[PDB]
Curated annotation (Swiss-Prot), chains A, B, C:
Residues that hold substrate according to the record: K32, I64, N97
Reaction equations catalysed: 3-phenylpyruvate = enol-phenylpyruvate; L-dopachrome = 5,6-dihydroxyindole-2-carboxylate
Disease: Rheumatoid arthritis systemic juvenile: An inflammatory articular disorder with systemic onset beginning before the age of 16. It represents a subgroup of juvenile arthritis associated with severe extraarticular features and occasionally fatal complications. During active phases of the disorder, patients display a typical daily spiking fever, an evanescent macular rash, lymphadenopathy, hepatosplenomegaly, serositis, myalgia and arthritis.
Keywords associated with the record: Acetylation, Cytokine, Cytoplasm, Immunity, Inflammatory response, Innate immunity, Isomerase, Secreted
Residues bearing the modification N6-acetyllysine: K77
Organism encoding this protein: Homo sapiens (Human)
Active site: residue positions: P1 (proton acceptor)
Protein name per Swiss-Prot or TrEMBL: Macrophage migration inhibitory factor
Amino acid sequence: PMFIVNTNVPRASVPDGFLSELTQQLAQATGKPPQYIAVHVVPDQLMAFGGSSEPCALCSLFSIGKIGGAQNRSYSKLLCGLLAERLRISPDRVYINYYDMNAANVGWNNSTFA
Amino acid sequence: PMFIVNTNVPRASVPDGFLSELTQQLAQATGKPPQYIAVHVVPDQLMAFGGSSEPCALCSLFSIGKIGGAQNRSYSKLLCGLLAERLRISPDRVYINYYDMNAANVGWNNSTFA
Amino acid sequence: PMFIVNTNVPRASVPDGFLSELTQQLAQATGKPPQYIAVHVVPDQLMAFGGSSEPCALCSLFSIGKIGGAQNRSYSKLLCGLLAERLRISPDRVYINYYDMNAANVGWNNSTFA
């Protein structure tokens, strides 16, 4: 799985340990081993949410399966919880685009996951 | 909706009020309230278009519906127009990826839009 | 085609000529004219792969067609090879999301490719 968070929160406001916490919690949420979880945080971004510049986040979660209505609600509760607790972003200023990737459409290690 | 613009144009060349203009024009174009429009501008990027490092942009527009053949032509005229007028990027050096997101695949406020 | 590479490798470790090499190699691999190939490299990123902050890359390849099982395996060998040779990133620390874009969902030059 691959999780990306783009935010206007400054780099100094991203706590130590955050990439590991994301890795750990996404391994548990997705059921996939942490060795397969990739995380990316992009602070200090020029962005607006609903016409204003209070803390916000625009995010992506890609997974080969483990994507669906109930699962995505669960992911959103987890991820908005983490962004609120750790980056002080209001859950109503977070968007997460979920993608169910076909194994043949994910490259890794000179091949794909097909 | 979520609009992202990645460009090699420098930060100083992004006019004050550009995010607000994108928010307002996208609210009008998509018919969605401005409260639900998110915009993200990423200047100073290491990118090339056709092998050239002249000004260019690589963009994304995500919407839950309001995506289709004719609507995307209209969005492209609008957004290439704004990038030309405000960032001096030639329309033929802009790509915009359009995505028609399923409501169940968009997280927000600890849940999804489903 | 549009190729994006996000990496924790520092900017100084991205060799001169890299965007041109990516453009040229992707033109040959995809069969598309180099005029239509866009490339974007984002170094210095805060990211982890498998919980580790050793060199890694999270990438995207978009194309209108020329995406599929065998083609994507071939792209992955090419792109992992270039990232290993030029950025010293292990192929097993690269993820590439492949996207087969509908021509109607790609804006360019004030319209779409439909």
